[PDB]
Amino acid sequence: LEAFGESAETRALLGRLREVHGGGAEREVALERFRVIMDKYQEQPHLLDPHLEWMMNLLLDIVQDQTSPASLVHLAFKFLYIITKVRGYKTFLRLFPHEVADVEPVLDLVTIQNPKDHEAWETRYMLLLWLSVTCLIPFDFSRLDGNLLTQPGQARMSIMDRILQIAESYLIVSDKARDAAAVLVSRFITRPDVKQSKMAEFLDWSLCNLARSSFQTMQGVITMDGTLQALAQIFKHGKREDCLPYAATVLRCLDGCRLPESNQTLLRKLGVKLVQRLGLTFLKPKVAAWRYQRGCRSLDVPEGVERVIEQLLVGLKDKDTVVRWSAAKGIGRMAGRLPRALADDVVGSVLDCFSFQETDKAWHGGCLALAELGRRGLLLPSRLVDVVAVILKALTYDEKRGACSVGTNVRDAACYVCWAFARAYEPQELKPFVTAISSALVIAAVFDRDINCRRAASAAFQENVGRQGTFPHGIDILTTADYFAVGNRSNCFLVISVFIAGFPEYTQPMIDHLVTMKISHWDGVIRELAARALHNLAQQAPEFSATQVFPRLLSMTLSPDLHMRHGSILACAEVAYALYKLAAQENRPVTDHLDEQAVQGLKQIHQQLYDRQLYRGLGGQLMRQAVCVLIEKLSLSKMPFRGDTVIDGWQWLINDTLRHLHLISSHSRQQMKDAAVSALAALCSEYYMKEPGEADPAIQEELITQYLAELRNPEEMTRCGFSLALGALPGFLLKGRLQQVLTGLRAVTHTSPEDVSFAESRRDGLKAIARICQTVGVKAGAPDEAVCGENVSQIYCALLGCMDDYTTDSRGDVGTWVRKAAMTSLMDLTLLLARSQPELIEAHTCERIMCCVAQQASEKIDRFRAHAASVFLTLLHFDSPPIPHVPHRGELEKLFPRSDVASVNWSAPSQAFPRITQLLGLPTYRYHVLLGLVVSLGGLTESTIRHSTQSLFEYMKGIQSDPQALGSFSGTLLQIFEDNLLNERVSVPLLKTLDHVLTHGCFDIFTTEEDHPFAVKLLALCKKEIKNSKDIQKLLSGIAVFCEMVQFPGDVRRQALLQLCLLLCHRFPLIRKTTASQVYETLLTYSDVVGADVLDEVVTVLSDTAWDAELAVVREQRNRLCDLLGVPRPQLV
Amino acid sequence: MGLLTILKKMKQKERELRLLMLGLDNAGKTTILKKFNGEDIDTISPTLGFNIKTLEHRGFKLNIWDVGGQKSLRSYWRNYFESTDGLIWVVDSADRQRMQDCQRELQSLLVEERLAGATLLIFANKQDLPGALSSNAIREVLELDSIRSHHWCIQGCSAVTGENLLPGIDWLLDDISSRIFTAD
Amino acid sequence: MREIVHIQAGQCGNQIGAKFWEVISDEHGIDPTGTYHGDSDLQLDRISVYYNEATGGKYVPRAILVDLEPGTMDSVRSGPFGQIFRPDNFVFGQSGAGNNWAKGHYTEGAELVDSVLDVVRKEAESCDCLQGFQLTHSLGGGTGSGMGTLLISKIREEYPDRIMNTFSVVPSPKVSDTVVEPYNATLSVHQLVENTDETYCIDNEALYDICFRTLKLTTPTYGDLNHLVSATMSGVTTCLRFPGQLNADLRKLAVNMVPFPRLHFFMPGFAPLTSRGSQQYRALTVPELTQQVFDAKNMMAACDPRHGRYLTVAAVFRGRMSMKEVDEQMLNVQNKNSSYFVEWIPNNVKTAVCDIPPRGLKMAVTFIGNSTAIQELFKRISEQFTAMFRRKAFLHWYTGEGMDEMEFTEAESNMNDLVSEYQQYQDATA
Amino acid sequence: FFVATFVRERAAVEELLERAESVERLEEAASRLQGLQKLINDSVFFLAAYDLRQGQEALARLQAALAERRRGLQPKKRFAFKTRGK
């Protein structure tokens, strides 16, 4: 935000507290609205300064009114506390009234408060603060009291005694008001007259409370906390010569409270805080003589001092981050007012915290103490070699302890120390350590994994550049790397990294740190990021990357550590790729940079790894992936390894990786397979090539024969691997034997009686098939080399053979995965020809493809219904050039404007069903869209079915009146019933759709005619479908369609009544009861269905007969009902 | 607390200052405070305690605390020394008899502990009067050359006409910005 | 395993957390002071599962109040039962996270997680054998979502083998009017499916509809929302706070209600529905309670159980009644409404009885279900997320804090794959 | 085998610490703790959660014992100013 925009709303809400205080119905909503409006300025409370003066005047005028009830004054105290916690009490109470006349009234209010009223605690809190504001008056309390002996006997209590009693009573409550009392302790006991009459008493009571309180009970702890807070406030806001005569007695009681051994972290912090205020009471404040000459504002000793320093040093080694910071602040404050020689004695102790590297807490405390000492300029030049050295280790503290890493606090404290160094020393006495400090912060600002550490390092670098100006290229590294640019880690590791390394002052150390730390990280993501950084920084330093870093990595690739080996292999591959890219831009080979030494090691990475069976196990999977990536990079960089055993070894490893993918974690599987096919595509295009556009006959006969003989394996993972290994083959190696590979994948994407559950095989088969069509391209008269007209028809047939592939296996429609891949294969086929030989795109095949796509664009699966719509839009709008035969391409364009297509969420049913239903108007896609709408309407999701029914009802309104429209759609739907009968996929959802359509009242014009062909055939279809069943959904769905079709008069009515009477005596009593209920409903709903005044007896015998009895008892009732309705009685054999 | 929050708090505290206004009664402290803000001068009454004001000047948030210069109030001045970045000592030029008393008062304010590191701006108020002492007279009678632990600078003014008031605050801000500001 | 540490992040989480503690204290007889004053031994037979024994026979809570601002931290400490907690268990900052997941997960949260993991190890140190964790936060608010999901990840990285359970409160446009709540919600899911083991879905739209239509309220407040959330929490944890053989520990409850790693979102339900200042003298029978607990109106989520298939169902009946009648009613409900139950996980409906009914009610019933219909609660989020992300609106708040579009893409993909898996498992062997 | 060698090394470290009376005793003992930690952090790609928790607890107990032994054998003197060192 920028300013306060909700001014009128806040004013009205504040002027509404006088009509929403009695009942709480409009009291809670107002508070909620106020809190929601005030929370928006929680991070920018400075933007409320110009509004917090008039809001406090309105809030004070309500509480100051004597006719303002308790409920009304308490409401005004909650808003005040809200404003205080929003803006801040220090900045809010300062503007409150502070006159003399406001001394007696306010106090009186504090006297009429119940401490046991949790429903109005906000009143007891804020009020106290207001009192503390009325103790900043320069008069005495005796002058305001006047004459106290005005009443007989009972004397009046002075204001000082009342305030003292109130403070003593509220420093021992559990609520937030104790804290407020501490504010009054720093405003009342620090006064000139109150101190003279309420300092010995208040200090004797506090000592007694500290002496008789335990940290093992709930109350005692509260009293001790309150007393410690009061003592800290007294020693802070109090004088040194009024409080020094008591600091030895207090120190003793504090030490006696044995707090450093309590498990109360807040008591220890208060004790440490009280230990530094008492200590600063033993020494006079000093002033930094070193100011006014090192930067602008913007951009004798008592014996107790030794004990205080010892306690602070002991606290530095605490487990909590709060006590460590408190002790560091105390040490800094103490050192800020000590001699120049004795102060050093403290530094020598802080260094002792860096003895053991495993104690991260000690290192953090030492770094915090060093930062606090440097911020005040209390560190001598002699301590630069010992301190700065440590800091260079603190900026790289990142150790692991199993599953949880450590060192984020250490590196954060290292940045604060570096920032403080900007003002701790002078530009002349920090010269021999500028380069080391600068590059250290540079490595932390671009290469840390935590954003906090990166931002801290950036801030430290900016401070050092602004206050010293001795950092090489400070302005450049400060303008590019800032609070915004440093936010991104990828940019810092790839973009900003190269810019910072462009200079010769950051090329060697950056690469060294990347190679000896970041590459050997404990996270794969960090290792990949470091590898990419080294790659990007390998074009600014080819000599250093090919002469000092490459050999450095060749020795680490053989280390026992797995992560180190992986990182070294990645770094070597990246360096080789960068050197090859650099040599390509100078018409020179890559062997010039990579000497014989490099060529040898690179030709020994895969061989040595296999010698130690390192490729076995989970750890061996990462070595396999690294070797695959290395082989891919070497083959893409064009290496002189043609005709060597290294190529045979690489072929073997790739073949083994795919022959054992079922032994790979499903989570990290798809990756290891797309990493082996990619490596195969580069190696077979740089080494299997005898002449331009050819290949070794011997190498082409062994590979294809081996891969086409593995597409029929019994393992599915091996089938998929070989399928993708056959879709990556180069075009020079498919020339002459393309028809064989085509016939092979066709069988790999087919479904036999034994390959019913091989859904993943067809996916990769179709993926590979289209991949080979796009490699070989289209060519006239070339069935063995490219896509001609002699092989275009078979591919289309194979692609459209997988469309009718719905597999409801244990998981569900695994077929959706095969039905998805096919949708892509066509998307890459019809398009490819459209960019070369669009004539091959037949009319019937294209129409069938467009129909299948429209059908798939209406399923019950939002994910796959969003892909189908995208594919359809990509194949309909295509105008570069457009598709030759698209049924209704003008209507489709008008219904799907290219402009309003990119903003349509097809994944959401709401923004997908209303639009896909409009395709019914096209007779070509009418059947295929109605089938989809039917299979989607009979699902189970509420939103999907609702959106489908809404679109169907909004569409059938324009054809219900038209007879021929209701005579074409009805026929199409009855053809889908004859097309999908006993399928069990379309039969169930088609019955539910028919029942819903009949209940809505759509086929009404046909009900007037007797024995309409539509119902005549629908009854036969229902008889053929519902007959012989088991599941209850089909039976219930069939009984609904029957009782809905009963409405049609004629002989169809009698046949439906007979079928209902038959189903009444189903094998399951539940089905019998359901049929009876539906018959009663359809009898009491419609009219003229029963004549001769025999309906009364029918309904009576239906409501009286118990359908939950046996069959021999209900058969007689069924026969009686049939005789009463004029229906033949079925026989019993 | 991390370094980002520490820097944020330091920047927030750097944009806040404290200017304690002191001086003998009947000197013109309330008049100067009202003229610097633009309020009315015909309706000003002696402070029965101490007044507080907050404003923004050159992006800096200035909080002025005008304390009464009465005899019974000086003893309470110690209650306004905590966190003091500037001390505006007002001196009446026409007041020539009580000068000795105004010299002892400013001399003791300099030997304090909390007021050690804080700029000093002395305003010679009521300069347009006939018997108004000059700047050199007030500088020599109060012994300003002996001051060495604080950066002082005398400068006459006149709240009745609002003259030489902006230069004083400008110099105070320039002197405050010349030194480094560190939290505690 | 016999001690559970409680955590609560964000304002709503802290408020929901403080209400549940008050409810379990009133049910166990623990007055605000901390001394036992109930009237049943069962209240003390399982008191060490959430409380700690201290001098004077006192029961100290085991919760940790966590926030980035001080408002909620002062509101709970000053509440009627505020004194019960530990003064050093309140860990909060000053600025908040401003409805930004990034600010609460990478800056203020990333800085306060250090102190948060200090009190957490303080509670785990005073536990003979830690059993798990129970966090209470919301997926809408920035601080409540970001830093709280940052505490789940830190606990999963630190403690290797420990159960993780949360009470995620899904926001709703009907309650709040903040535009960046869809993003703050989706990302959270992307973490839960890959971090938390158990997660209860408490949609705010369902609570609003139950308070505005069923309880008849012209202006349902956050006081009414906390009245429904605390009762649900007390009902779903009644087995862990009292003796029992079905789900006495968290590991057994997880093994019985988590058929798959990613699928663990349980929509809770409680009956009879009540409100603040309302006493229903009529005592509903066991059949009526069994029929009302399975009704979609009594569900805390905006999903209809009928439009889906059940996977794991756990019912609890609190009140003096007979076990044979409850078993017969459960069998009848399973037989009649058999189409709404997957037949590929036999014995997937558990029933338990307790002799400690809630306060103010003689007969109560609970429902913790794992139906695939819960996917509907995510589809709604999907639409909003996609609609707001395609035009790039208010995205600079995230990209400017270290995040990027890759995270939103990843979270959208994970959530979308969770919906597809739910739909597939719902139609298993169709 | 991993659990076996971990238990063996833990028992060896405990026996060495139970008889630690030199800085070389404690310094060698503080290099077996580094090795164990390095081994465990490099084996969390195939170990269970209960075993990892047990190993973490054992490492924490051993570190606490080593810290106690270092504090006992080497009692750090209290703080004292360097005035009049000789």
Ligand SMILES: Nc1nc2c(ncn2[C@@H]2O[C@H](COP(=O)(O)OP(=O)(O)OP(=O)(O)O)[C@@H](O)[C@H]2O)c(=O)[nH]1
């Ligand atoms: N049921 C319920 N929802 C709440 C409550 N308080 C907040 N919410 C919801 O939580 C979301 C807002 O999150 P908050 O809890 O305010 O967020 P936070 O954790 O405080 O985070 P920041 O506001 O960013 O500091 C919205 O969807 C609110 O409707 C509450 O008491 N009950």
Ligand SMILES: Nc1nc2c(ncn2[C@@H]2O[C@H](COP(=O)(O)OP(=O)(O)O)[C@@H](O)[C@H]2O)c(=O)[nH]1
């Ligand atoms: N002649 C003259 N009178 C002034 C000037 N400034 C203030 N006064 C008057 O001196 C009197 C004392 O002023 P006041 O603000 O009450 O001073 P304070 O209460 O001591 O701080 C008031 O009547 C002012 O109007 C000035 O520059 N010239």
Ligand SMILES: [Mg+2]
């Ligand atoms: Mg005045």
Ligand SMILES: [Mg+2]
């Ligand atoms: Mg909040």
